[PDB]
Amino acid sequence: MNLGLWRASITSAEVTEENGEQMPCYFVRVNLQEVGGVETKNWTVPRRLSEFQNLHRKLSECVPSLKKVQLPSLSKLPFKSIDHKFLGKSRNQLNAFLQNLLSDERLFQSEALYAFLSPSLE
Numbered sequence: 001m002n003l004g005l006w007r008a009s010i011t012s013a014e015v016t017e018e019n020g021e022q023m024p025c026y027f028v029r030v031n032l033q034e035v036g037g038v039e040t041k042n043w044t045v046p047r048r049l050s051e052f053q054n055l056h057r058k059l060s061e062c063v064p065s066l067k068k069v070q071l072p073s074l075s076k077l078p079f080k081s082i083d084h085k086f087l088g089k090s091r092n093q094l095n096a097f098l099q100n101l102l103s104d105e106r107l108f109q110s111e112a113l114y115a116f117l118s119p120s121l122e
């Protein structure tokens with residue numbers, strides 16, 4: 001495996017239902033053109049904010065400096081519903097997060113990063 005040849009970018013975000021609550025969902029476009037050979041090289045995988053937070057926690061085991069990184073968070077306060085400003089900023093933050101992970105040689109064999117960037121067939 002070499003995730004350092006994988007390119008990923010969040011192309012859009014929307015809200016979905018995870019359990020009972022409104023959950024931001026981010027569409028991650030993944031490109032393996034830099035990988036040679038004959039295989040599937042392009043897809044989009046939707047991931048929920050909660051799946052980014054899970055990924056952060058797992059990768060934080062392998063590389064404990066990642067514990068310092070703050071990801072977007074849903075406000076527990078009353079009247080803090082998800083709006084377009086939060087989706088837009090959370091998307092840019094999560095996108096920057098993906099760029100930073102994929103530039104980090106320590107993760108180029110991360111099974112968790114691989115499973116997160118891989119296709120999701122519900």
Ligand SMILES: [Cl-]
Pocket residue numbers: 075076077078079080081082
């Ligand atoms: Cl709320």
